[PDB]
Amino acid sequence: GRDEAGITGTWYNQLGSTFIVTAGADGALTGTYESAVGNAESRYVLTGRYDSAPATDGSGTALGWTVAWKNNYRNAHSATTWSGQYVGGAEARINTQWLLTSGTTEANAWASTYVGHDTFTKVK
Amino acid sequence: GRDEAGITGTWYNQLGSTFIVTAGADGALTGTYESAVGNAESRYVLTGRYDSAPATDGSGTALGWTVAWKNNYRNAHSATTWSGQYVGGAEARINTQWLLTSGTTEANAWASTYVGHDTFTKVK
Amino acid sequence: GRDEAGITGTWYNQLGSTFIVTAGADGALTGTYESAVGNAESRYVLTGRYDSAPATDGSGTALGWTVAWKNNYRNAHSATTWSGQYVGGAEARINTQWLLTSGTTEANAWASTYVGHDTFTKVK
Amino acid sequence: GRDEAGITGTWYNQLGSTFIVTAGADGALTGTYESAVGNAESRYVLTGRYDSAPATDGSGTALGWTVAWKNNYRNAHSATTWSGQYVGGAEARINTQWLLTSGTTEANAWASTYVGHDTFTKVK
């Protein structure tokens, strides 16, 4: 992918969470996520996809990934998906919006899903 | 996972899209997505995650997955993530909300992301 | 407005909530909202806006409104906004997505906002 | 309202849009919005609501408002709703997420709604 090298590595968001990802030539994202907030400790598996042949007109690179909040320490019975774009250059960023869904009863399902936004950088 | 068997298979949404998924014992989702709408033809790779040890209190099972809208036929320079829960039983459903991000210039980035909701069933 | 008459009246969503609205010739929406779920009882003030000169090509009519969840009975320290379109005809609908924000501390602000979707009809 | 004085005035977001609002003692928001981006020129009516008796535990103040993108100059056949909270103090902010719905045909309704986030400050 044009940005395989640009995306692969360690990223940090505004909450101090850590996103460790490898971008595959085939469009795969694989890695681990450590949340600095919520019902989470240590690393969680993530997987996702990215556009491995982005536009050459200065547009960002579309990508997304998922974490299910279960590991050997805790289970928050929830999953977050991040949808966003990678923007390359001196101050590289991944700009995302996310959806966090909990498992709920049918009676609480109206309140199942949080929305928010995270900005990832290669420093801090 | 408790719902590995329940989730694995072919699902259809209200737009007539087809979601073909395998649930792994390890919490993985792998498969293909065929959209009946938008800048899409034929199948696209998907990957995601699910809660492989959900609550036993009648709650749904949290999950999510990603499609990058690139395959051998087309590239829509975009990715969608679905976040939702699997609800088992006679009329099994996956109830989701989604985020579709396009690669954009910095000037158009305010308008990069669509939001919507899809309901998947095992029939139709 | 072309749909002033179509929008004005009593609407019901899939949760059994009641949306009582008047559409003004000037694009105003005014009325009351009664939620069948959550930290709510009785009616709450709402206000919003709609497109009073929609397209004549069969498109829906864009609109939105807000409820702050404070009245003489309760205060849930939260506000919901509905964004959607009115679709006229025999089975008239308002199809919406919503954002529910709570007042939070800066530490909990990542988890401040729910997202969901409501479909309003003139019956039930 | 506790923050009637804090909210009332001129606000600016990260795109250079201008939000002119009056907060009523009754929980009303009234004013005008000028977008620096998209299919917009000059001012548009807005209305909304806020929590006029917020929590006294350091939480923000929940609020929301709507703009229908019609005025005497243009009609973008769309409406945006902002949902968020007001955070008082030396560097006062309104932190929002928004939903922009267009009027669409039933065939395009899956792609009717954008989501994003705006941060408003009293300077710039």
D65 labeled binding residue:
no
Resolution in Å equals 1.5
Instruction: Say how many C-beta atoms besides its own lie within 10 A of residue B42's C-beta.
Output: 11
Cβ–Cβ of C69/D58 closer than 8 Å?
no
This structure was determined by X-ray
Closest CA to A79 of D101, B35, B7: B7
CB C31 within 8 A of CB C20: yes
Quick one: tokens of B3? 């719902």
CA distances from C81 to B7, C85, C91, C95, C114 (A): 33, 13, 24, 13, 11
Residue A20 belongs to what domain range? 3-121
- For residues B56 and B64, what is the distance between their CA atoms, to the nearest angstrom? 20
Mutant choice from D50, D67, D77, D81 vs C, greatest count of C C-beta within 10 A:
D81
Which residue in D has a C-alpha nearest to residue B35's C-alpha?
D110
Q: What angle do CA A107, A112, A114 make, to 5 degrees?
A: 155
Q: Pick the closest to residue B61 from B95, B13, B112 (CA basis).
A: B95
The residue with tokens 């977001």 is D13
- Count other Cβ atoms within 10 Å, centred on residue D70: 23
Nearest residue in C to B116, CA atom: C97
Chain A with chain C: Cβ pairs closer than 8 A: 34
Instruction: Provide the pairing of β-strand A113-121 with C75-87.
Output: unpaired
Task: Kindly state whether D59 is in contact with chain A, defined as any CB-CB distance less than 8 angstroms.
Answer: no
Name chain C contacts of D91, Cβ cutoff 8 Å.
Answer: none
Written in H, E and C, the secondary structure of C10-67 is EEECCCCCEEEEEECCCCEEEEEEECCCCCCCCCEEEEEEECCCCCCCCCCEEEEEEE
CA D54, CA D51: separation in Å to the nearest integer? 6
CA proximity to C111, closest of A105, A39, B117: A39
Q: Look up tokens 């977050």; give the residue.
A: A80
Mind telling me how many Å the CA of C29 is from chain B's nearest CA?
24
- The residues in A 19-38 lying below 8 A from C, measured between CB atoms, are 37-38
Number of domains in chain B: 1
Q: Among candidates D70, D103, D81, which has minimal Cα distance to C53?
A: D70
Chain A residues within an 8 Å CB radius of D97: 115-117
Which chain C residues are within 8 Å of D115, Cβ to Cβ? 115
| Torsion sign, CA atoms D100, D103, D104, D106 | positive
Distance, in Å, from the CA atom of A46 to the CA atom of D105, rounded to the nearest integer, reads: 37
Q: What does the buried/exposed string (b/e) look like for A75-103 if buried means 16 or more CB atoms within 10 Å of the residue's CB?
A: bbbbbbbbbbbbbbeeebbbbbbbbbbbb
- Which residues in chain D touch residue C27, judged by CB atoms under 8 angstroms apart? 45, 68, 70
Query: Is A50 assigned a ligand-binding role in the annotation?
Result: no
Alpha-carbon distance of B61 to B15, in angstroms, equals 23
DSSP state of D21: E
Q: What is the Cα–Cα distance from C68 to C48, expressed in whole angstroms?
A: 12
Q: How far apart are CA C54 and CA D103, in angstroms?
A: 8
Tell me how far CA of residue D40 lies from CA of A83, C50, C112, D79, in angstroms: 27, 16, 29, 11
Can you tell me which residue has the tokens 């103040």?
D61
Residues 6+ apart with CB under 8 A from A54: A1, A2, A3, A60, A61, A62, B77, B103
Q: How far is CA B57 from the centre of its chain?
A: 25
CATH number at residue A34: 2.40.128.30
Of the candidates B94, B97, B14, C13, which has an alpha carbon nearest to the alpha carbon of residue D113?
B97
B97 Cβ under 8 Å from any chain C Cβ: yes
Q: Residue B75 and residue B67: Cα distance in Å, rounded?
A: 12
Structure tokens at B51: 């809660």
Could you tell me if A123 and A12 are in contact, meaning their C-beta atoms sit under 8 angstroms apart?
Answer: yes
Return the SS3 of C5: helix
Please give the Cα distance from D69 to D77 (Å, whole number): 6
Which chains touch D (3+ CB pairs under 8 A)?
A, B, C
Measured between CA atoms, how close is B99 to chain D, in angstroms? 8
